[PDB]
Amino acid sequence: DVQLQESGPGLVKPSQSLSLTCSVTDYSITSGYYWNWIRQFPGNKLEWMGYISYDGSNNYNPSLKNRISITRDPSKDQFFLNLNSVTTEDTATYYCTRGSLVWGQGTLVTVSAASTKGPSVFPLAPSGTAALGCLVKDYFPEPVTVSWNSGALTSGVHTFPAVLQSSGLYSLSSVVTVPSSSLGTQTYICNVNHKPSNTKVDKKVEPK
Amino acid sequence: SPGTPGSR
Amino acid sequence: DIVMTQAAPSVPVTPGESVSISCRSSKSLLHSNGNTYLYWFLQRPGQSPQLLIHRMSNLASGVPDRFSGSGSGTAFTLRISRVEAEDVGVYYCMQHLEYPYTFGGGTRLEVKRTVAAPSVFIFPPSDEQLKSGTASVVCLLNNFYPREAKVQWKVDNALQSGNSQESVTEQDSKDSTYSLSSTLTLSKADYEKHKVYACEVTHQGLSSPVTKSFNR
Numbered sequence: 521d522v523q524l525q526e527s528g529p530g531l532v533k534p535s536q537s538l539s540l541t542c543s544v545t546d547y548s549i550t551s552g553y554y555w556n557w558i559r560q561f562p563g564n565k566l567e568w569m570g571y572i573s574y575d576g577s578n579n580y581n582p583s584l585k586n587r588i589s590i591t592r593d594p595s596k597d598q599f600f601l602n603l604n605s606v607t608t609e610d611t612a613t614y615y616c617t618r619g620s621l622v623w624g625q626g627t628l629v630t631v632s633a634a635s636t637k638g639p640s641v642f643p644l645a646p647s648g649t650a651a652l653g654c655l656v657k658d659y660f661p662e663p664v665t666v667s668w669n670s671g672a673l674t675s676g677v678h679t680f681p682a683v684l685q686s687s688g689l690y691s692l693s694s695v696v697t698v699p700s701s702s703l704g705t706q707t708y709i710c711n712v713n714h715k716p717s718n719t720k721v722d723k724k725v726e727p728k
Numbered sequence: 729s730p731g732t733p734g735s736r
Numbered sequence: 737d738i739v740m741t742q743a744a745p746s747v748p749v750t751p752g753e754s755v756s757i758s759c760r761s762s763k764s765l766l767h768s769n770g771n772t773y774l775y776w777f778l779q780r781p782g783q784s785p786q787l788l789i790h791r792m793s794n795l796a797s798g799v800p801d802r803f804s805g806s807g808s809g810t811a812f813t814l815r816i817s818r819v820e821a822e823d824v825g826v827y828y829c830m831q832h833l834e835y836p837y838t839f840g841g842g843t844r845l846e847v848k849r850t851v852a853a854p855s856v857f858i859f860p861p862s863d864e865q866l867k868s869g870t871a872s873v874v875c876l877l878n879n880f881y882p883r884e885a886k887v888q889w890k891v892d893n894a895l896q897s898g899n900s901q902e903s904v905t906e907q908d909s910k911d912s913t914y915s916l917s918s919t920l921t922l923s924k925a926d927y928e929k930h931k932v933y934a935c936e937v938t939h940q941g942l943s944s945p946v947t948k949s950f951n952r
Contacts, residue, residue, distance in 0.1 A: 619732035
């Protein structure tokens with residue numbers, strides 16, 4: 521089946537260029553269709569950026585026409601987005617699409633002059649059922665992923681959306697509700713992954 | 729047509 | 737540019753029942769070829785948007801037939817019959833008549849369920865964090881419905897303001913509930929000056945506002 525996948529950096533500095541690639545599997549980009557870039561801002565507003573057609577002809581959103589370039593490599597079934605002179609306003613999740621029907625998974629790009637920073641991981645200790653968790657604090661940029669007991673624990677897990685603190689660093693909590701009688705039989709370890717900083721942290725959470 | 733052109 | 741408007745930010749719906757979502761355009765989307773160029777998308781939490789309806793009333797490939805579209809000129813409706821848990825997310829209309837293609841602001845579909853009170857937990861700052869000079873106090877509200885919930889931080893019976901941040905999960909598909917995390921952030925110095933830390937929760941499912949607290 522036809523599938524699309526975005527690739528590129530997750531963090532770009534202002535004034536520099538954003539360069540994303542859409543790799544198309546099981547379809548030749550010369551065979552038909554428009555091949556679009558669509559982005560979604562924080563807050564969820566969607567914007568159509570432009571397309572490249574099956575013949576390589578472009579069509580750009582007028583609001584971006586001066587900064588944007590959409591090109592392709594038919595021999596590799598790839599098409600590209602280049603956005604010049606980026607600002608903080610270009611922070612968004614970028615999707616490539618074939619027409620309106622086939623979508624990539626999206627890739628988050630943060631535009632900021634701030635340095636990559638790994639999280640601190642603090643326990644939220646448990647005081648029928650007991651709640652416990654991990655506070656994943658002071659990381660940049662998004663995203664982090666959190667699993668519990670290496671993925672063996674999924675039931676009752678809530679990993680909250682990150683909040684942007686005034687410092688410009690993110691914070692989130694991941695919690696799990698658990699039988700209070702299992703606190704002495706099963707250990708609870710949160711596995712925190714922050715790919716942008718190459719950080720992997722396992723934190724054991726035990727009763728206070 | 730304003731729609732996405734399909735396979736040629 | 738054509739301006740697309742979705743008047744409703746969200747709509748609640750009982751599972752098994754039907755719901756209509758409205759969209760409007762600033763210009764007619766009818767073309768001389770007879771088609772009206774209005775598309776509908778659903779974006780489920782954590783997922784890419786997916787096409788539901790193209791050209792106003794045509795069901796897209798691989799989409800359940802409980803989704804249908806109708807309209808005329810500048811007014812359009814997506815109907816979802818027999819709403820199920822998998823239908824939660826944000827529904828967007830998009831005009832496809834003229835470049836640039838433009839999207840409505842979206843309408844979130846909420847599954848309506850019985851009122852559920854949150855289970856509330858308070859977490860003091862860890863000893864590890866307290867070394868850093870900052871103290872984070874966390875209040876957890878677990879598995880509640882509806883979404884509206886007030887969290888009041890009280891430090892020695894004094895009402896806090898502008899020193900906490902909240903986060904809410906997307907409506908899940910296992911029990912149609914929300915969960916909420918509230919983090920009170922203080923300096924270690926300010927934290928150690930006080931004793932009683934309290935999180936007061938107001939919610940429809942509670943008989944009265946519930947307070948969870950600890951002594952430092």
